[PDB]
Design an enzyme around this catalytic site. Sequence first.
Site, short mmCIF file in Angstrom:
data_model
loop_
_atom_site.label_atom_id
_atom_site.label_comp_id
_atom_site.label_asym_id
_atom_site.label_seq_id
_atom_site.Cartn_x
_atom_site.Cartn_y
_atom_site.Cartn_z
N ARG A 185 -19.24 4.48 5.11
CA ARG A 185 -19.13 3.18 5.92
C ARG A 185 -17.75 2.56 5.60
O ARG A 185 -17.63 1.86 4.47
CB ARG A 185 -20.40 2.16 5.43
CG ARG A 185 -20.50 0.88 6.39
CD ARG A 185 -20.88 1.22 7.51
NE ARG A 185 -22.29 1.67 7.88
CZ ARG A 185 -23.31 1.15 7.91
NH1 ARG A 185 -23.20 -0.25 7.95
NH2 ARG A 185 -24.31 2.09 8.08
N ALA A 240 -3.80 6.34 -0.48
CA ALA A 240 -4.93 6.71 -1.08
C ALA A 240 -5.90 5.49 -0.96
O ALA A 240 -5.62 4.56 -0.86
CB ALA A 240 -4.50 7.17 -2.64
N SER A 241 -7.21 6.08 -1.12
CA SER A 241 -8.43 4.86 -1.06
C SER A 241 -9.04 4.41 -2.18
O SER A 241 -9.26 5.55 -3.09
CB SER A 241 -9.48 5.20 0.13
OG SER A 241 -10.52 4.40 0.11
N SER A 244 -13.40 1.29 7.20
CA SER A 244 -12.71 0.67 8.67
C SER A 244 -11.68 2.21 9.09
O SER A 244 -11.76 3.08 8.34
CB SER A 244 -11.98 -0.55 8.38
OG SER A 244 -10.85 -0.34 7.47
N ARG A 245 -11.33 1.83 9.95
CA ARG A 245 -10.33 2.95 10.78
C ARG A 245 -8.68 2.62 10.38
O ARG A 245 -8.13 2.36 11.15
CB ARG A 245 -10.42 2.94 12.45
CG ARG A 245 -9.90 4.19 13.15
CD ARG A 245 -10.28 4.37 14.43
NE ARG A 245 -9.61 5.62 15.10
CZ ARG A 245 -8.35 5.45 15.63
NH1 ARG A 245 -7.53 4.43 15.70
NH2 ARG A 245 -8.13 6.51 16.16
N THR A 246 -8.75 2.96 9.00
CA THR A 246 -7.38 2.91 8.37
C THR A 246 -6.76 4.13 8.80
O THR A 246 -5.32 4.24 8.22
CB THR A 246 -7.48 2.66 6.86
OG1 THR A 246 -8.45 3.51 6.24
CG2 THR A 246 -7.91 1.13 6.79
N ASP A 257 0.84 -1.26 -0.05
CA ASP A 257 0.01 0.06 0.10
C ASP A 257 0.87 1.25 0.13
O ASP A 257 0.52 2.23 -0.58
CB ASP A 257 -0.97 0.02 1.26
CG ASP A 257 -1.83 -1.11 1.21
OD1 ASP A 257 -2.31 -1.78 0.16
OD2 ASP A 257 -2.60 -1.32 2.33
#
Lengths: 39, 365
Positions: free
Chosen positions: B188, B254-255, B190-192, B110
């Site tokens: 919605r 980045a997501s 996760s806590r990333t 990542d």
Amino acid sequence: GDQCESNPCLNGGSCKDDINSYECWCPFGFEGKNCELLE
Amino acid sequence: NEDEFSFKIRRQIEKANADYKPCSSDPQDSDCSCHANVLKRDLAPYKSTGVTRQMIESSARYGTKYKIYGHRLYRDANCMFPARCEGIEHFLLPLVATLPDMDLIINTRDYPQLNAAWGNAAGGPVFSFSKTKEYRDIMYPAWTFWAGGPATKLHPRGIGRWDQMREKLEKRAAAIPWSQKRSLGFFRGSRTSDERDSLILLSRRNPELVEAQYTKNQGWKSPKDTLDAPAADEVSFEDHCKYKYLFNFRGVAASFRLKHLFLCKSLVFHVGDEWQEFFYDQLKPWVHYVPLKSYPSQQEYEHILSFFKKNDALAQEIAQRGYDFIWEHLRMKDIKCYWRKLLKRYVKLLQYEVKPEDQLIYIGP
């Protein structure tokens, strides 16, 4: 490490973060480093 | 209070849109120029000196070695993320027949690898999906455009097949037009990153304004990872499209969420301006989405949501432009031609003869 946060284990697998890398635990039926192959 | 905020935001929008120019002269972008500024800037530091064999050997520890030799693809036997290598290979394999020889160190983690604060052993070249100005890594389109994104219950083989997802979301955007979407903020995930916390806490205090909850990810270690609340269920990308206001945050880097949100025809609120994928440069704030600074406050969220709730036609215009940009300029064709253009420019930098290496395995075609 935080490599497990991106859910690298497929097909119901669970993940453990090591210092360098990660490891997947794969359910019966799947194998490979990411549980990506059929058993 | 409210008036000052409105003036500031409308000024920013007017200016952004007055200054805006399309990423290509023609919308079909026949020459694959839309995202070209990024690959040029990523390769520019290698232009004067080029890339030596030593630089490649030195960079090899930072990712998975791929070699195109004699129009055949070779790779390290050990890929750190096999499912990501599969996604990458989907795009490389069709190009190997018409590409010259090259060595590519492709990081599949990542996080990028070449800190520009450090120096020398981290000169590269190394390819990574995501970076900031702190890193020298060359961006490539992520594996997940084909395969190997995060695995969840709705996507047990990993989120992938952007081609299929585009069609699914186009249909769902058509089914839930702007006026039928709920006038609430939605998240919605996760806590990333702790940049996400204030939105979740705002939701807990004011669920009528924001519906934001933490899911659990595979790295879960304690209740702190959901800020001491029961883990919420996954919500499909399709079901995000029932909300007018969709939030995106950086994660580890980045997501992959971001691109999905635009295809709902919802108004995207993108938090932070550091973490990039290759296509973010041509996503322009106030033109395609609403930018928020990193670590937004609850009061900032309340102000910006209240503004757009009261300026609904303006909200829809931005949302429409964002939708249109991803629809027209993040096609599979755009992914494939970026890969091709990137590799063709990169190979010109090589100042050495690529030689075979017997320890590498044959991938294809």
